[PDB]
Every structure is written in C-alpha cells, then in structure tokens.
C-alpha cells in the first residue's frame, strides 16, 4: 500500500460488466457514478491503482 501501483488506461473501449469475472469481489463501491452506468460514459483517462 505504501508503494501502490498505478496504471494508466487510455485509448480503449472499456466494458465494465466483465470486471465481475476477473475477481471474486461482491460489489463495487462507486462515488459520483453508478456501476451499471459506466458503460454509457466516456472518460478522458482512467487510472487503476492496485
């Protein structure tokens, strides 16, 4: 966590419904947006911190 990894996501088509198949998490926790709406939106850039 002190050396958390950041990855830049840009210039791609993002299907967020398939994230449920990658990890066995129970649900998203979203702020300012809803998970089921993420497929209707566009973003300048996305950041993935792990």
């Amino acid at each position: 966590v002190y050396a958390w990894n950041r990855k830049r996501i840009s210039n791609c088509v993002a299907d967020y419904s398939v994230l449920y198949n990658f990890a066995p998490f129970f649900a998203f926790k979203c702020y300012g947006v809803s998970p089921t709406k993420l497929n209707d939106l566009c973003f300048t850039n996305v950041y993935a911190d792990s």
Binding site: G32, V33, S34, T36, K37, D40, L41
Partner: protein
C-alpha cells in the same frame, strides 16, 4: 429623468435574471444538470439528487 419607470423595468429584469441564474446551483446535489445526474447514476441515487 424617468428614474422610477426605469427602476420598475430593472427590478423585473433583475428578478428574472436571478431566477435563471439559480438553475446553475447544485443545492447539495452532485450536479446542477439533470442530464448529468441521469446519465451518471442509477434510478435510486439519481432520484435522491
């Protein structure tokens, strides 16, 4: 010379302009735009905003 009549006109115009400008207030919501709220949130949270 016609200060009172101009004042009546100005008061009306100012009230209408203030009413129009109030549409950009968020009032505690995430956005002042209904379309952004409806396109970014699901039914229940959008209803709250």
């Amino acid at each position: 010379a016609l200060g009172k009549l101009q004042d009546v006109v100005n008061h009306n115009a100012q009230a209408l302009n203030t009413l129009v400008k109030q549409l950009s207030s968020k009032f505690g919501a995430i956005s002042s735009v209904l379309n952004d709220i409806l396109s970014r949130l699901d039914k229940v949270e959008a209803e709250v905003q």
